[PDB]
Amino acid sequence: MEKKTIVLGVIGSDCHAVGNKILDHSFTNAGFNVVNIGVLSSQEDFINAAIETKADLICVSSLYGQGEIDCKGLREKCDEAGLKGIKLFVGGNIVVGKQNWPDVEQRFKAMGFDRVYPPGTSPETTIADMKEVLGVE
């Protein structure tokens, strides 16, 4: 791929745009091609931003404690979508609140989601994450 496109969608319902109004702005500001898929959005649409742009990474934004409940195997759905190579981020209220890292990353990484941000994360982590991951910083 020519550039690194990140595609962030706020997944499932129970989402106004909280921590996804300036939390998107951060990434767009980070010099990334950042496609705002929209607050409340299906994964076949995030996939669609990866078809459109050529995503290197696909982010889900969880604001409802059910991040996993939809998201599980978007890496594999991206894989499945003929968009294999994409490494995924999953951030926010990834589990109900948030459980415990050893178990949680075992969950996410088993599906393929490489990196797990907590609920109420600085975007500096996510930016430093995509940089460090994608041969930057």
Q: What positions carry a catalytic annotation?
A: 14, 16
Tell me if 71 is assigned to a ligand binding site: no
Q: Which residues neighbour 87 within 8 Å (Cβ) at sequence distance 6 or greater? A: 56, 57, 75, 114, 115, 133
* Tokens (6 digits) for 103: 């178990």
Tell me if 91 is assigned to a ligand binding site: no
Tell me if 35 is assigned to a ligand binding site: no
Strand partners, 116: 90
Tell me if 22 is assigned to a ligand binding site: no
Helix, strand, coil shares of the chain, percent, nearest 5, are 35, 25, 35
Tell me if 25 is assigned to a ligand binding site: no
Tell me if 59 is assigned to a ligand binding site: no
Tell me if 62 is assigned to a ligand binding site: yes
Q: Which parts of 2-122 fold into alpha helices (H)?
A: 23-28, 43-53, 67-71, 74-80, 101-111
Which residues are annotated as part of the binding site for adenosylcob(III)alamin? 13-17, 61-63, 93-97
Which residues are annotated as part of the binding site? 13-17, 61-63, 93-97
